[PDB]
Design a protein around this ligand. Structure first.
Ligand code: SF4
Ligand code: SF4
Ligand code: FES
Lengths: 230, 56
C-alpha cells in the first residue's frame, strides 16, 4: 500500500509511488548533479548530468523522469556512472567561454562546483568554441547569451509561472540561440526571479552587475516589506 | 687572488689547506644568467584516451 522498495546503494527504503529517482535520493540524503531539473518547474530531461546506473541495464537512465518501479537497486557511485558524469561534464565545458573572472556568479556558479566535485581535470577540444550574439532582454536584466548552456530552464519558467511566452529556442545543432527573436523587452512581474533561475552567469542583474562578488558579502535573515505577504 | 706570493705563502703557512685553490670568492665559475629558455615536461598524465579521473 503506497510503498515501493529501493536499494539506494544497497540501502532499502520505502518510497511513495509515482515519484522518481531524484526525490528518493533526496529522501535518503543523496544528491545527484543536476542542471535542468528544478524543484518548482516541470521535468524536461535535457541536462543529462543527472544520470545513474541501475543494475541489469545496458544503458544508463536519467534520474528525473524514470518512475520508481518495484524493488530497485540504484548505484549512485558506480564506475560507469562516474565515467558518464566525466564525459557529460567534458562536453559541457567545450562551448563555454573563459569568463570566470568577469562573470557575475564566481562563487555562485553551478558549472564550477559540479566541474570540481564530479568533472574531469585534463581537457581536450583544441579548436572551436562557438560564440553567440547577445540580446537586450530589458534594462533590468543584463544578458550575455554566450555563457548560456541551453539548459532550457527559463523557458519552462516563463511558460508556466509567467505565462508570457517571449523566450523560445531558435535554431538547431550547435546553433540554438535561446531568447526573443523580435528584440522585444521581456517585461512582466516576477521578471526579477529569472536571474536566480539562470543556473549560470547568463541572465544576471543590471544594477548589481559589476559591484560585488559572493564570497565577501555576508548573509542576513530578514522579512520582506512593501507587500502584505512578506 | 690579486696578491703577491709572499703574503700568499704566509697564508699557506698560517694554515696548510691550499688557500689559493678554494678561496671562497668566485669570479667566473658562476653559471651565466639569462639562460636559454626552458621547456617543461608534463608527467604521467596528458596522454589521452585512457586517463579517466575516475580511475586515478
Ligand atoms: S539562459 Fe540560463 S536558464 Fe536559460 S537555457 Fe540558458 S543557461 Fe538555461
Ligand atoms: S557561468 Fe560559471 S562557468 Fe560560465 S563564466 Fe560564469 S562562473 Fe564561469
Ligand atoms: S535533470 Fe534529468 S536530464 Fe537534466
Amino acid at each position: 500500500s503506497n510503498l515501493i522498495e529501493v536499494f539506494v546503494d544497497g540501502q532499502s527504503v520505502m518510497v511513495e509511488p509515482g515519484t522518481t529517482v531524484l526525490q528518493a535520493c533526496e529522501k535518503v540524503g543523496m544528491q545527484i548533479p543536476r542542471f535542468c531539473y528544478h524543484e518548482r518547474l516541470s521535468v524536461a530531461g535535457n541536462c543529462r548530468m543527472c544520470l545513474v546506473e541501475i543494475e541489469k541495464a545496458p544503458k544508463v537512465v536519467a534520474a528525473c523522469a524514470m518512475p520508481v518501479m518495484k524493488g530497485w537497486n540504484i548505484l549512485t557511485n558506480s564506475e560507469k556512472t562516474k565515467k558518464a558524469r566525466e564525459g557529460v561534464m567534458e562536453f559541457l565545458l567545450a562551448n563555454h567561454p573563459l569568463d570566470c573572472p568577469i562573470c557575475d556568479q564566481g562563487g555562485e556558479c553551478d558549472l564550477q562546483d559540479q566541474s570540481m566535485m564530479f568533472g574531469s581535470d585534463r581537457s581536450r577540444f583544441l579548436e572551436g568554441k562557438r560564440a553567440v550574439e547577445d540580446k537586450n532582454i530589458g534594462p533590468l536584466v543584463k544578458t550575455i547569451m554566450t555563457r548560456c548552456i541551453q539548459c532550457t530552464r527559463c523557458i519552462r519558467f516563463a511558460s508556466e509561472i509567467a505565462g508570457v511566452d517571449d523566450l523560445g529556442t531558435t535554431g538547431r545543432g550547435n546553433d540554438m540561440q535561446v531568447g526573443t527573436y523580435i528584440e522585444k523587452m521581456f517585461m512582466s512581474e516576477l521578471s526579477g526571479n529569472i536571474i536566480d533561475i539562470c543556473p549560470v552567469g547568463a541572465l544576471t542583474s543590471k544594477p548589481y552587475a559589476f559591484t560585488a562578488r559572493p564570497w565577501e558579502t555576508r548573509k542576513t535573515e530578514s522579512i520582506d516589506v512593501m507587500d502584505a505577504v512578506g | 687572488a690579486s696578491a703577491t706570493r709572499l703574503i700568499q705563502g704566509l697564508r699557506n703557512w698560517a694554515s696548510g689547506r691550499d688557500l689559493q685553490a678554494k678561496l671562497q670568492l668566485r669570479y667566473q665559475e658562476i653559471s651565466k644568467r639569462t639562460q636559454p629558455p626552458p621547456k617543461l615536461p608534463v608527467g604521467p598524465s596528458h596522454r589521452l584516451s585512457n586517463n579517466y579521473y575516475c580511475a586515478r
